[PDB]
Design a protein around this ligand. Structure first.
Ligand code: ANR
Ligand code: OLA
Ligand code: OLA
Ligand code: OLA
Ligand code: OLA
Ligand code: CL
Ligand code: CL
Ligand code: CL
Length: 269
């Protein structure tokens, strides 16, 4: 469906290119589901006030892990080694599935940030609402632009400019809440949370770069570079981010007198 609308469908792949992409996606699966088990076992050391932030990391791990797994199977479904190269056999592969999955996972990432920022009640609800509307705005327009990466690069860029507006506004909300709520942060995660902001600015900006590959490297090695960028960005924005969020959750839990958190941190001291 969308498979002919993505540049991956344009090329044959060397075994090297093809298998590297397969292994990137597969490694990504392993990393997300390994991290899942960690988030799972560690959630008992998080106080009830924050426990949802760690649960959201579990959910994101399986959601992203399942899309990466799906992408890897679809990749190997779409191509067969015929006459010295991997050649397209059918329309099973598309990056579009990622975009659709972001509809779920980006709101999860954002909500876990709001929780460890100690937002609650009306502010939590309204902040979350505006954030995920801005995120949905960004994702949807990006998803549309992405359908044009083969036959209309101008349209890719204009949808991307629109998507970037949403992105920039979302980042402004994120950053503003982070920097205005630093003072509430316990133990003293007020320092840690600013690192989380920069990680997000870094990791999330890789996705617009991946998005633009069809405009500056429209060949089989650009296909590889795009999956590499997605891979770097996924483990940064999801796994490393998640670990920091959970660190902040446990640390604030301990500072607030949750004994299992104290015992946990103590037994790694
Ligand atoms: C784990 C997923 C996650 C953090 C995804 C991030 C998506 C993101 C920030 C994409 C943003 C853009 C953009 C700014 C312009 C081009 C389109 C798109 C959707 C790649
Ligand atoms: C922060 C997450 C890091 C993600 C790790 C990615 C693992 C691979 C790292 C770089 C290897 C580069 C070697 C690629 C050789 C290209 C083979 C080919 O395309 O022909
Ligand atoms: C668009 C829809 C946004 C829904 C926002 C979800 C809010 C999560 C928890 C906040 C709360 O219920 O107080
Ligand atoms: C890729 C584009 C990078 C986007 C902006 C973030 C890059 C800088 C992040 C460095 C960490 C800063 C810090 O910890 O204070
Ligand atoms: C070399 C690349 C470095 C990659 C870093 C990997 C993940 C570390 C993030 C986990 C959370 C650390 C807690 C922060 C702290 O101790 O203050
Ligand atoms: Cl609590
Ligand atoms: Cl995802
Ligand atoms: Cl300090």
């Amino acid at each position: 469906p969308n498979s002919m609308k993505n540049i991956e469908s344009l090329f044959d792949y060397s075994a090297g290119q093809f298998e590297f992409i397969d292994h990137l996606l597969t490694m990504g699966v392993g990393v997300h589901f390994a991290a899942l088990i960690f988030f799972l076992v560690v959630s008992q050391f998080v106080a009830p006030k924050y426990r949802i932030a760690t649960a959201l990391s579990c959910i994101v791990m399986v959601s992203a892990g399942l899309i990466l797994n799906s992408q890897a199977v679809m990749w190997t479904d779409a191509y067969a080694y015929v006459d010295g190269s991997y050649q397209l056999q059918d329309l099973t592969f598309s990056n579009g599935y990622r975009y659709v999955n972001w509809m779920a996972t980006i709101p999860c990432l954002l909500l876990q940030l709001l929780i460890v920022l100690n937002l609650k009640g009306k502010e939590l609800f309204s902040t979350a609402t505006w954030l995920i509307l801005a995120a949905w705005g960004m994702i949807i327009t990006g998803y549309v632009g992405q359908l044009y990466e083969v036959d209309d690069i101008a349209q890719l860029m204009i949808w991307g400019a629109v998507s970037t507006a949403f992105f920039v506004v979302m980042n402004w909300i994120v950053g503003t809440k982070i920097f205005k709520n630093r003072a509430t942060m316990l133990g003293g995660t007020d320092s840690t949370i600013t690192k989380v902001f920069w990680l997000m600015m870094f990791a999330w900006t890789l996705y617009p770069i991946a998005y633009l590959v069809p405009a500056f490297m429209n060949n089989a090695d650009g296909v590889v570079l795009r999956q590499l960028l997605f891979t770097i960005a996924d483990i940064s924005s999801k796994v490393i981010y998640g670990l920091m969020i959970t660190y902040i959750a446990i640390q604030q839990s301990a500072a607030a007198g949750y004994v299992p958190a104290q015992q946990a941190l103590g037994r790694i001291g």
